Amino acid sequence: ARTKQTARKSTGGGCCVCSDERGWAENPLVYCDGHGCSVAVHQACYGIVQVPTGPWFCRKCESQERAARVRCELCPHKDGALKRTDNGGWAHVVCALYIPEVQFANVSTMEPIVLQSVPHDRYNKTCYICDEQGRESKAATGACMTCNKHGCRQAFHVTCAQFAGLLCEQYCGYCKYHFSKLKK
Ligand SMILES: [Zn+2]
Ligand SMILES: [Zn+2]
Ligand SMILES: [Zn+2]
Ligand SMILES: [Zn+2]
Ligand SMILES: [Zn+2]
């Protein structure tokens, strides 16, 4: 597999789940070899038990599922690191991690992603970011996390917060207003 195992920048992107650009000897950043696929994930961020000596393919590329059928059940963005769900669909690993009540059937392999126990309070929210970034039709879809500032009611999709730099590592996120004043 093509991997990065250090933080070194060659004298000659980052993880889809955790956004870290560095790799480790015991936790490499592995790059999907699927055609036109740009997934890169840490072994531990994606549940790769054995990094192959040959090519490595993410689960979506392995499935060769129709590109029309590859969609996260929990957010409106495709691309990124996906696993199959218990309901016969797909979901981002990052969405699974940052929506509190989502689980994995196996935490070593991090799959399938289990949605059966999400309560309806993740599902009746509106993503304020989608409402801001020209995605008004998708803002009320999928599942939102809530700002981790106690009492805040701002809600947002995990991936939308991820793209906005509003997640942090317990897996939580803050609306932009409240994130600005948090000591990083
Ligand atoms: Zn990672
Ligand atoms: Zn792939
Ligand atoms: Zn998602
Ligand atoms: Zn959104
Ligand atoms: Zn907030």
Numbering used by the authors: 1 to 12, 23 to 179, 189 to 203
Give excerpts from the publication:
To define the molecular basis for the interaction of AF10PZP with the histone H3 tail, we generated a fusion construct that contains residues 1–12 of H3 covalently linked to the residues 19-208 of AF10 via a short GSGSS linker. We note that the position of the H3 sequence in the linked construct, which is N-terminal to the sequence of AF10PZP, was critical because a free Ala1 of H3 is required for the interaction with AF10PHD1. The structure revealed a saddle-like globular fold of AF10PZP comprised of five zinc-binding clusters. The Ala1-Thr6 residues of the H3 tail occupied an extended groove of AF10PHD1 with Arg2-Lys4 forming an anti-parallel β strand that paired with the protein’s β1-β2 sheet, whereas Ala7-Gly12 residues of H3 curved away from the protein surface. Characteristic β-sheet interactions were observed between the backbone amides of Arg2 and Lys4 of H3 and Y41 and L39 of AF10PZP. The N-terminal amino group of Ala1 of H3 was engaged through hydrogen bonds with the backbone carbonyl groups of P62, T63, and G64 of the protein. The guanidino group of Arg2 donated hydrogen bonds to the side-chain carboxyl group of D43 and the backbone carbonyl of C42. The side chain amino moiety of Lys4 was restrained through a hydrogen bond with the backbone carbonyl of E31. The side-chain amide of Gln5 formed a hydrogen bond with the backbone carbonyl of A35, whereas the backbone carbonyl of Thr6 was hydrogen-bonded to the backbone amide of G33. An overlay of these structures shows that the two regions of the H3 tail occupy different binding sites of AF10PZP.
Human AF10 (or mixed-lineage leukemia translocated to 10 (MLLT10)) is essential in hematopoiesis and implicated in blood cancers. Here, we show that the PZP domain of AF10 (AF10PZP), which is consistently impaired or deleted in leukemogenic AF10 translocations, plays a critical role in blocking malignant transformation. Crystallographic, biochemical and mutagenesis studies reveal that AF10PZP binds to the nucleosome core particle through multivalent contacts with the histone H3 tail and DNA and associates with chromatin in cells, colocalizing with active methylation marks and discriminating against the repressive H3K27me3 mark.
